[PDB]
């Protein structure tokens, strides 16, 4: 008979941080506000009544309806701080709570350190279908950023929102198998400055420096400095592996490290082939070898 | 049990085993079990590659240290088969090692 309870939600995001690349998770600290209208009630002085923390339980035990809202994409139970009910004499009920949770989402870091991510929060009632409880609207409020040069991530655009219905095949046990879902999304790009100057720039100077073997004049010098170069990429690959995030795929920097290996290895072959087939003519590939590297690099 | 001897080409079986804590199969028995897993868009960005739908089993565990027919418990077993995504380990570890 009765229509669904309309619930208005507002989410305040204080901080998105603690990205875990391999687990595709991220930490979110904020507030959730949920408002709906109940049966009108008496309140002291006919002013809004406030119920905090453990006291909320006494009211639910006394018959107050407080539906449980679940973060669909939260990993484990969120860390809930203070929580509050505001009951108005006209029936309005406003639930407010601080939360800190780990959230999951499809995250592609293949373009690291130039990757873009969409941090999302998915809210959905745990027990009441959209014939008993639906989300009427969603408002999102984010942090006011001063200067983003110090921030790991650069936010782009306003937070997007969606209200949709989720239908579950396994709930055919008349027409109450659908649930209302809120979705928040924060678009952000990574701050690459650190990785350009401390990782991509030095690795460039090292790969480039390896090309100077073609300027040593004896064959025993070209091949032996090549091992010093090979050893420099190894030492550098380990410097990066100790800082850059762990991923199940290669990134731009990894392919550069790999290219450093291939360049040095190929050079070691050209140095020996040119020796046994003291041909210093092909040793004039000082310009041929670097160009061939860059040509292959585009592909 | 997880064997990583064929790393980075290893294959694992992720298991959940469920059983009543106190009621034997004369008091509580699992009549059926259904499993639902994530619909994957593309697995190229994932660490593990799921292979096949979830496997299920319903069996009876008989305990010799509970002494008539009151020492068997009903157990559900779910298994998710997966293979490791080896791309990174192939290109950044095995290949440079062969060159060295």
């Amino acid at each position, epitope marked *: 008979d009765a229509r669904p309870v309309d619930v208005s939600v507002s989410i305040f995001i204080n901080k998105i941080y603690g990205v875990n690349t391999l687990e595709q998770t991220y930490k979110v600290d904020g507030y959730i506000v949920a408002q709906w209208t109940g049966k009108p009630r008496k309140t002291p002085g006919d002013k809004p009544l406030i119920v905090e923390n453990t006291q909320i339980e006494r009211w639910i035990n006394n018959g107050l309806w407080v539906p449980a809202l679940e973060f669909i994409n939260v990993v484990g139970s969120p860390d809930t701080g203070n929580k509050r009910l505001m009951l108005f004499p006209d029936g309005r009920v406003i639930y407010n709570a601080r939360f800190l949770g780990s959230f999951s989402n499809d995250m592609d870091f293949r373009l690291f350190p130039f990757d873009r991510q*969409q941090f999302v929060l998915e809210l959905e009632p745990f027990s009441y279908n959209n014939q008993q409880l639906r989300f009427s609207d969603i408002q999102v409020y984010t942090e006011n950023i001063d200067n983003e040069e110090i921030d790991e991530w650069w936010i782009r655009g306003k937070a997007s929102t*969606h209200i*949709s*219905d989720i239908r579950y095949d396994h709930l055919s046990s008349p027409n109450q198998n659908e649930f209302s879902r809120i979705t928040v*999304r924060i678009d952000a790009v990574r701050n690459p400055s650190y990785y350009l100057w401390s990782f991509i720039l030095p690795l460039g100077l090292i790969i480039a420096a390896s090309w100077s073997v073609f300027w040593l004049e004896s064959f025993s010098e070209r091949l032996q400095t090549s091992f010093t170069c090979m050893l420099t990429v190894v030492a550098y690959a380990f410097y990066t592996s100790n800082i850059l995030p762990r991923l199940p795929y290669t990134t731009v920097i990894d392919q550069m490290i790999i290219a450093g290996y291939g360049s040095i290895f190929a050079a070691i072959l050209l140095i020996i082939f040119a020796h046994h087939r003291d041909d210093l003519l092909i040793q004039r590939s000082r310009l041929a070898f670097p160009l061939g590297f860059l040509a292959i690099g585009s592909v | 049990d997880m064997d990583f001897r064929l790393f980075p080409f290893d294959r694992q079986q992720f298991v959940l085993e469920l059983e009543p804590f106190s009621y034997n199969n004369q008091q509580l028995r699992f009549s059926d079990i259904q499993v639902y897993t*994530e*619909n994957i868009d593309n697995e190229e960005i994932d660490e593990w590659w799921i292979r096949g739908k979830a496997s299920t089993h319903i069996s009876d565990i008989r305990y010799d240290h509970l002494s008539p027919n009151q020492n068997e418990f009903s157990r559900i077993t779910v298994r998710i088969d997966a293979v490791r995504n080896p791309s990174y380990y192939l290109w950044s570890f095995i290949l440079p090692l062969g060159l060295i």
Partner: nanobody
Amino acid sequence: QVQLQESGGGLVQAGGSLRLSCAASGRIFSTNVMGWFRQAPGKEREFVATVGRIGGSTVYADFVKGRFTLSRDNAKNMVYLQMNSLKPEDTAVYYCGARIGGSDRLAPENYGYWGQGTQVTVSS
């Protein structure tokens, strides 16, 4: 990579039924990334339906109200949208798109390889 072609739409009276089909061809190993959208002249392209993250679930726009159903045929790389109890407000050209990336099944930005579309008209 892939290409999408819609079909099954036409003229129907208010309350009728239509079944839209979308056929995919190319580098696509699953139909989970395909999603239906619609766009009538005057409004922006709005989401309609796509598959949910967990098996057995499906995401529908708030205006569906249980009237549309998204079915699948992974063998034939085809998806179907059974549209019933049609309203005059459902009139639009319905597009079929494939998810490119991101992590928001509802955002058209994350969809590409759009198809020509199929016109769906509903009169009184």
